[PDB]
Amino acid sequence: SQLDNLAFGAIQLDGDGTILQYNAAEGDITGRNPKEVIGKNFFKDVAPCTDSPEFSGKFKEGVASGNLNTMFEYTFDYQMTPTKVKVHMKKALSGDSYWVFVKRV
Ligand SMILES: *C(=O)/C=C/c1ccc(O)cc1
Numbered sequence: 001s002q003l004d005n006l007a008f009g010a011i012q013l014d015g016d017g018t019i020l021q022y023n024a025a026e027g028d029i030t031g032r033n034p035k036e037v038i039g040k041n042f043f044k045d046v047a048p049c050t051d052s053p054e055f056s057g058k059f060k061e062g063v064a065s066g067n068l069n070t071m072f073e074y075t076f077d078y079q080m081t082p083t084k085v086k087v088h089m090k091k092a093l094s095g096d097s098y099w100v101f102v103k104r105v
């Protein structure tokens, strides 16, 4: 069914980093209101601590090459309590979009 039925955070991005979908579990981790963040740039506005070579830089390399499927640990710490997460970022398996899935670790 739903994006909002997943127990882990899920964000859909276009290749500019624009937020297309943002689920309730992700908001619960980060304190963001899903409705508020849709349409903003993930890397530059919502989540500036991800604007780093290993996160946004890896994303942009994958958009360019059309190849992206990586998992890594990260700490989210902008306008929230520092929170360790595991991130799975990938090019979608159909169409032309990208996903960032997140769980607490
Ligand atoms: C660093 O600035 C991380 C912030 C953040 C990560 C993930 C989100 O869904 C929202 C903000």
Ligand SMILES: *C(=O)/C=C/c1ccc(O)cc1
Binding pocket: 069, 090
């Ligand atoms: C993308 O890398 C998808 C991975 C995935 C989807 C659902 C599963 O049960 C297992 C892997």
